[PDB]
Amino acid sequence: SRITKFFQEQPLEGYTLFSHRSAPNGFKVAIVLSELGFHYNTIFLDFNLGEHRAPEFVSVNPNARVPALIDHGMDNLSIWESGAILLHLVNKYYKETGNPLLWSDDLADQSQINAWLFFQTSGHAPMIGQALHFRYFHSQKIASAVERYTDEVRRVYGVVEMALAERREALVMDYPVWLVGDKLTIADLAFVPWNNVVDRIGINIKIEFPEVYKWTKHMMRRPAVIKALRG
């Protein structure tokens, strides 16, 4: 019913973010939302109560997962999939102000930003999730599965590390380094919520990925980021 009444009286403006206090993809969206100055409220869904199975929610997000965002100012447009939401945001912020904050107005740069973005949503997140699953939630213990995904997650972090190290190397010919166009974009941010959980599968970023550590730290010091991870 909680979800019901809300869809009975939705704000004519602003944004509503459906998330979960455990969903990194949710906090990922909160961060961007916060960095762009977008005012919004969060509705943490109780999966225990099966609220994510509520008809009103499946309408918003047919995949019945989080995050899902509602752009009220746009006739209550519903955007699901964190990657889709990030793009909708940087695009909307750009057409409105003329400044491609956390984005780019150059086609080539966007292709670069998207690459890291899809890589994060397609190869980073799913893997951390499969690792966590066998390590902690499977119906039985399967060391080989845990090792498969743990390795993979290490492999993907190696690509990011190597990339960051490469960017640093280039500028030499603890200064902050970024994935695309020497500027903070949604590319860098997408990884932040996750970097904070991989410890749970035995990965020690600070130690095994020095570049990723500095990187995450620079981002962890931004007001908007802190605000999001607290809300």
Ligand X SMILES: N[C@@H](CCC(=O)N[C@@H](CSCc1ccc([N+](=O)[O-])cc1)C(=O)NCC(=O)O)C(=O)O
Contact 91, 103 (CB under 8 A): yes
Tokens linked to 27: 């906090």
Shortest reach from residue 87's CB to its own copies, in Å: 5
Shortest reach from residue 226's CB to its own copies, in Å: 27
Q: CA 59, 61, 63, 64 torsion: positive or negative?
A: negative
Gap between the Cα atoms of 42 and 17, Å rounded: 5
Contact 32, 189 (CB under 8 A): yes
| Number of residues binding to its own copies, judged by CB under 8 A | 46
Q: Which is nearer to its own copies, 11 or 129 (CB)?
A: 129
* Crossing angle for the helix pair 143-171 and 210-220, to the nearest 10 degrees: 80
Gap between the Cα atoms of 222 and 206, Å rounded: 19
Could you say which of 46, 122, 200, 204 contacts its own copies (CB under 8 A)? 122
Q: Is 66 annotated as a binding residue?
A: yes
Tokens linked to 86: 């990030």
Could you say which of 49, 56, 108, 171 contacts its own copies (CB under 8 A)? 108
Residues 131-170 that bind its own copies (CB under 8 A): 133, 138-140, 142, 144-145, 148, 156, 159, 162-163
Q: Which is nearer to its own copies, 42 or 110 (CB)?
A: 110
Shortest reach from residue 90's CB to its own copies, in Å: 11
Shortest reach from residue 83's CB to ligand X, in Å: 6
Whole-angstrom CA distances from 97 to 33, 68, 131, 168 are 15, 24, 41, 31
Contact footprint for its own copies (CB under 8 A): 62-64, 71, 74, 77, 79-85, 87-88, 91-92, 95, 107-108, 110-112, 114-115, 117-119, 121-123, 125-126, 130, 133, 138-140, 142, 144-145, 148, 156, 159, 162-163
